[PDB]
């Protein structure tokens, strides 16, 4: 039944994961302690583990290197249906330094959470992999999360490693360090990494949703709405991308090029839609969640997901048309870049919605700006003491910088015409 194990890491990771679980509960038709259309019940054992009671508890693990935010979800509404022994937390945080979470205090907690997932896997017919919600900006989410990834693959070498990475933005002064280090790790160990830019996320809430001074919560509603729509193919039968491996093959042409952008539609929260309108609003840069120019660049592969009261034929005719008009944005040497999936289940309360997973080469601008910030500090050898006092090295920094730089070089490289070898 191909089960999936979710791991939340850090404040952002545990808060985002929380919104994800709170969302897909209703879609599957569950109470906030785990209890119609019957499609909601089919792939229910993918994200939820059947407790001998007819009641479901999420196959989730909530790790943070400090009780702070993990305490918060603990006594919130969905704090119920979470397995009490899936909560892992240390005494003191990691003060926003990647080194502590990855070498010192984070590594000491890793073994304790491994027991949980090792016990969890001992309850799966045939587990397919893991998904990780974390933030590259901090010290626990980036540092411990990546260390968790590397050791999870050492124990489960043939399982899928999906990841929902949250990218920091210029608005603490060491976020580029932590993000560049985690990226250096993700490019070597992550099978799938959905990149979500906090700047784009913020701009949607402020410009589109006209929320004056938005909160992390509002930011998470968009992350959650995307994650739900993304995993639609994973929680409902008779689809296209049913596995985490099938989805990866269709989306990842080259091993170290597995970082994707996400888009969601509709968004506008006034205070019905038509398939062609929805499709236009899906490819709209105003409806994207990454501060890079998607029109300037090329899509390597695309995977859209339509949900709700929408006919398959009218969705397929609309995607095929959109691909014709914008055939210059889709790479020529990958015939059929786009996989379009339709689901009858509605996100509620919405008649229909569309989720957008793109492997665009324009994402280089995300790694570009961060690499430009990493450099400006690394040249001055700034803030190093806080990292190098945890057992880190200046060489490891230069590796992360030069590595992620090559990552960019590859994206720009593949924006070339039909050339042999």
């Amino acid at each position: 039944m191909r089960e999936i194990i979710h791991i939340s890491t850090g404040q952002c990771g545990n808060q985002i994961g929380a919104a994800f679980w709170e969302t897909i509960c209703g879609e599957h038709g569950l109470d906030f302690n785990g209890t119609h259309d019957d499609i909601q019940k089919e792939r229910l054992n993918v994200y939820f583990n059947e407790a001998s009671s007819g009641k479901w508890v999420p196959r989730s693990i909530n790790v943070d290197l400090e009780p702070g935010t993990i305490d918060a979800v603990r006594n919130s509404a969905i704090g119920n249906l979470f397995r009490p022994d899936n909560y892992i937390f240390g005494q003191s945080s990691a003060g926003n330094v990647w080194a502590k979470g990855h070498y010192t205090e984070g590594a000491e907690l890793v073994d304790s959470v491994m027991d949980v997932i090792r016990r969890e896997a001992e309850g799966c017919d045939s587990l397919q992999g893991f998904q990780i919600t974390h933030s590259l900006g901090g010290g626990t989410g980036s540092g411990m999360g990546t260390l968790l990834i590397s050791k999870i693959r050492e124990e489960f070498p043939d399982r899928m490693m999906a990841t929902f990475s949250v990218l920091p933005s210029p608005k603490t002064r060491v976020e580029p360090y932590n993000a560049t280090l985690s990226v250096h790790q993700l490019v070597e160990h992550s099978d799938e990494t959905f990149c979500i830019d906090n700047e784009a996320l913020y701009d949607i809430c402020q410009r589109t949703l006209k929320l004056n001074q938005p909160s992390y919560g509002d930011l998470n509603n968009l992350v959650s709405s995307v994650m739900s729509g993304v995993t639609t193919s994973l929680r409902y039968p008779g689809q296209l991308n049913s596995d985490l491996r099938k989805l990866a093959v269709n989306l990842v042409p080259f091993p170290r090029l597995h970082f994707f952008m996400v888009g969601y539609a509709p968004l506008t929260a006034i205070g019905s839609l038509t398939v062609p309108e929805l499709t236009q609003q899906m490819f709209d840069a105003k409806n994207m969640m990454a501060a890079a120019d998607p029109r300037n660049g090329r899509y390597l592969t695309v995977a859209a997901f339509f949900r709700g009261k929408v006919s398959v034929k009218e969705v397929e005719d609309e995607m095929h048309k959109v691909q014709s008009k914008n055939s210059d944005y889709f790479v020529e040497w990958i015939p059929n870049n786009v996989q379009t999936a339709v689901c009858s289940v509605a996100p509620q309360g919405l008649d229909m919605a569309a989720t957008f997973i793109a492997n665009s080469t324009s994402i280089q601008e995300l790694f570009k700006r961060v690499g430009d910030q990493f450099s400006a500090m690394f040249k001055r050898k700034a803030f190093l003491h806080w990292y190098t006092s945890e057992g880190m090295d200046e060489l490891e920094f230069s590796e992360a910088e030069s590595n992620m730089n090559d990552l960019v070089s590859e994206y720009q490289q593949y924006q070339e015409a039909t050339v042999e070898d």
């Binding site: 070498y103 010192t104 590594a107 590397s150 050492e154 124990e155 070498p157 057992g391 880190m392």
Partner: protein, 231 residues
């Protein structure tokens, strides 16, 4: 604060780090950790890579001082080598990887042949972690290209080694296969039919590309080198 014996295993990782580096300098500028291997067999797996990196660095320094008794050596190899291959060659750190291998090679010099060492590395072929399998293959590779089949009964040795080779040659992971083939060309430099036809073709190509010390072998070379001073 002091003493060294407790700091070596004290709760804080940093203390263990500095203490290992102290053991290291103690070895270089020459404290008998040669008697009981359990000591360094604990340090080789320090559970803190930054400190573990230096325990292995110091381990390599420890064996570099000795320079007798083939029975005690077999125990050192049976205790350390499997640990260095499992937790040192599978590591993703440059210093750890290089130093770990050097220990495995230098520990093999204490013996008369690669037999005992190789037979300790072999059972890793049945692990499910690919980079661990490839590490073992690359390890057995290095063992040969450093000492050769010198002082080995190739009648008993090879058919055991090749016994678990085909299964690895068709392994899913690319790197394992790449190292397996690299092990084949070495065995030649001193089986097919169960191998993919295309693998054999590429092998035959790689074959057409050839031009052309244990502890005791060093003691004997110097035994005559010293006695050569009969002026």
């Amino acid at each position: 604060t002091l003493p060294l014996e407790e700091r070596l295993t004290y709760k804080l990782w940093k203390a263990r780090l500095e203490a290992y580096k102290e053991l290291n300098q103690l070895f270089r500028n020459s404290q008998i950790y040669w008697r009981d291997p359990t000591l360094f067999a604990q340090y080789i797996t320090d559970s803190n890579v930054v400190a573990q990196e230096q325990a292995i660095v110091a381990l390599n320094s420890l064996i570099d001082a000795f320079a007798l008794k083939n029975a005690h050596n077999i125990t050192l190899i049976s205790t350390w080598t499997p640990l260095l291959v499992e937790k040192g060659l599978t590591s993703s750190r440059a210093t750890t990887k290089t130093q770990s291998m050097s220990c495995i090679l230098s520990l093999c010099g204490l013996d008369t042949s690669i037999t005992q060492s190789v037979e300790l590395v072999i059972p890793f072929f049945e692990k499910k972690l690919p980079k661990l399998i490839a590490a073992a293959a690359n390890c057995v590779y290095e063992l040969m290209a450093a000492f050769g089949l010198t002082n080995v009964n190739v009648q008993t040795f090879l058919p055991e080694l090749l016994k678990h080779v085909p299964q690895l040659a068709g392994h899913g992971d690319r790197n394992v296969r790449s190292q397996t083939m690299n092990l084949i060309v070495e065995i030649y430099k001193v089986l097919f039919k169960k191998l993919k036809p295309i693998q054999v073709k590429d092998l035959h190509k790689l074959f057409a590309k050839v031009g052309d010390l244990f502890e005791w072998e060093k003691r004997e070379l110097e035994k005559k080198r010293s006695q050569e001073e009969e002026a």
